[PDB]
Design a protein around this ligand. Structure first.
Ligand SMILES: *C(=O)[C@@H]([C@@H]1NC(C(=O)O)=C(S[C@@H]2CN[C@H](CNS(N)(=O)=O)C2)[C@@H]1C)[C@@H](C)O
Ligand SMILES: C[C@@H](O)[C@@H](C=O)[C@@H]1NC(C(=O)O)=C(S[C@@H]2CN[C@H](CNS(N)(=O)=O)C2)[C@@H]1C
Ligand SMILES: C[C@@H](O)[C@H]1C(=O)N2C(C(=O)O)=C(S[C@@H]3CN[C@H](CNS(N)(=O)=O)C3)[C@H](C)[C@H]12
Ligand SMILES: C[C@@H](O)[C@H]1C(=O)N2C(C(=O)O)=C(S[C@@H]3CN[C@H](CNS(N)(=O)=O)C3)[C@H](C)[C@H]12
Ligand SMILES: [Ca+2]
Ligand SMILES: [Ca+2]
Ligand SMILES: [Ca+2]
Ligand SMILES: [Cl-]
Ligand SMILES: [Cl-]
Ligand SMILES: [Cl-]
Ligand SMILES: [Cl-]
Lengths: 242, 242
């Protein structure tokens, strides 16, 4: 079903961290985690919500394609990379929240709810402000539920156009070399306790796909680099990446 | 305009090589090369023809998607890479000429010809064997012509479905990190003199795209790695990648 390999807890232990890593072997239809309980604990998605938000925007024509330019609104915000024009690729890369809050308002409460239900996304609850519910509203998703959603996206099985799903998977591209391709999205939920960081996505190999979703306790912005580092220690331990 | 930059030749001579690198700044609509004459010299495309071949195969339904398996059909025909199953992703990556021979036979010469004329691909000539003309037939393409073709592909402007162009560009993924994305294709022309190696594609930045096409004399297979090496040194020299 889902095997618990607690030897992964060493990688959180060394870095003085608490969290969960979940892997899914698509060929073998087998899942692995260091913590079955935390694997199914549901949290705010934070910026991991940029994946379904992007899909819905594209499917509804709110975003025409990955080249459409979203003008900086002229408000100088805290993250310098947000203070400029963006397309879908760079808004995903730099996790540009204002662009996605605009997407959400144009999508609207009713279409957003209907799509999240169509997606079976987390708890399907978008209570709160239409442009912030994934930050401080009622939506919740677990690491295992992220995998479930991502597997559909990978197979083009979500109830949106194939084109939307291909564009979003292009925009998720994070790293690629001769050994693997990673498509993924980070998140950091701070507006409601507990403060946690996310990394969800998958690793594409020649012959298989390994889906992953991790989250960890993140009191300060210090440990944000550990989201990718710990996941990759796990991947390396299992010899998924060289 | 086309600017000549002879200073790039230092990267060929230090490797006891001769060749041409062509770069195109999409934003500026400006091209750069070390050798204007060789930049326009037309050669057999060899494995770089996998780009138009895959596009046509997908557009015509010869290949259903990037997951369809092409089974090994017994033959252990010397090359080990061709001793296993493939899909479009892996067949682009590795030398598996029987798979692309099968595409071309199914496409057939009438539609192959029509498509290469619609692509304005090289000298638009498919004379020779329908299952090998890109290796030993009459088709020829120059580095500048590779750029013209790739630019259309990047803009989804070729006269095939948008979906087929998106899939081939996925299959072209070679390298990606926080600084750049490279989509590209190698080639090695040996069946007709002169023996040459190819590397064609583009570099996606946050705010621009740099297309490239290089070829270089390749008297033996031991210099194949110099295709990527020399191209990347020219990109680094120009500060396109760090
Ligand atoms: C297509 O041009 C040709 C393929 N393509 C290539 C190529 O390198 O572009 C080759 S090279 C052959 C297979 N891999 C060996 C080299 N390994 S490496 N890591 O690149 O040094 C030798 C092959 C000839 C088809 C049409 O034959
Ligand atoms: C709620 C939203 O504000 C939040 C929700 O995800 C946003 N999404 C993400 C994310 O994690 O993708 C970030 S990260 C941000 C960029 N610069 C700092 C990081 N420096 S480092 N090098 O990592 O220490 C913090 C935002 C805070
Ligand atoms: C070199 C290419 O061929 C790669 C590819 O593709 N490979 C697969 C795969 O197919 O998954 C793996 S993963 C690795 C093998 N098995 C271990 C755990 N398996 S297990 N019992 O935990 O499920 C991890 C390799 C990277 C190999
Ligand atoms: C930091 C990111 O935003 C990157 C991006 O995007 N950038 C562009 C671009 O926009 O091309 C470049 S390239 C570099 C600047 N100019 C030189 C050649 N100029 S020139 N006149 O010879 O063509 C090479 C940077 C990598 C920067
Ligand atoms: Ca449901
Ligand atoms: Ca050099
Ligand atoms: Ca033949
Ligand atoms: Cl967001
Ligand atoms: Cl499903
Ligand atoms: Cl070929
Ligand atoms: Cl991609």
């Amino acid at each position: 079903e889902w095997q618990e390999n607690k030897s992964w807890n060493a990688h959180f232990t060394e870095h003085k961290s608490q969290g969960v890593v979940v892997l899914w072997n698509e060929n073998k239809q087998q899942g692995f985690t260091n913590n079955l309980k935390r694997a199914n604990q549901a949290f705010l998605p934070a910026s991991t919500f940029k994946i379904p938000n992007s899909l819905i925007a594209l499917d509804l024509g709110v975003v025409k394609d990955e080249h459409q330019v979203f003008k900086w609104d002229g408000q100088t915000r805290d993250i310098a990379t947000w203070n400029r024009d963006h397309n879908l690729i760079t808004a995903m890369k730099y996790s540009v929240v204002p662009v996605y809050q605009e997407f959400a308002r144009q999508i609207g409460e009713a279409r957003m709810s209907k799509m999240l239900h169509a997606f079976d996304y987390g708890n399907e609850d978008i209570s709160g402000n239409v442009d912030s519910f994934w930050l401080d509203g009622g939506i919740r998703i677990s690491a295992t539920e992220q995998i479930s959603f991502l597997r559909k996206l990978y197979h083009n099985k979500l109830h949106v156009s194939e084109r939307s799903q291909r564009i979003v998977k292009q925009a998720m591209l994070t790293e690629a070399n001769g050994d693997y391709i990673i498509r993924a999205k980070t998140g950091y939920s701070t507006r409601i306790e507990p403060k946690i960081g996310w990394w969800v996505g998958w690793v594409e190999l020649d012959d298989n796909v390994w889906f992953f979703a991790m989250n960890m306790d993140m009191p300060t912005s210090d440990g944000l680099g550990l989201r990718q580092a710990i996941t990759k220690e796990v991947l390396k331990q299992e010899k998924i990446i060289p």
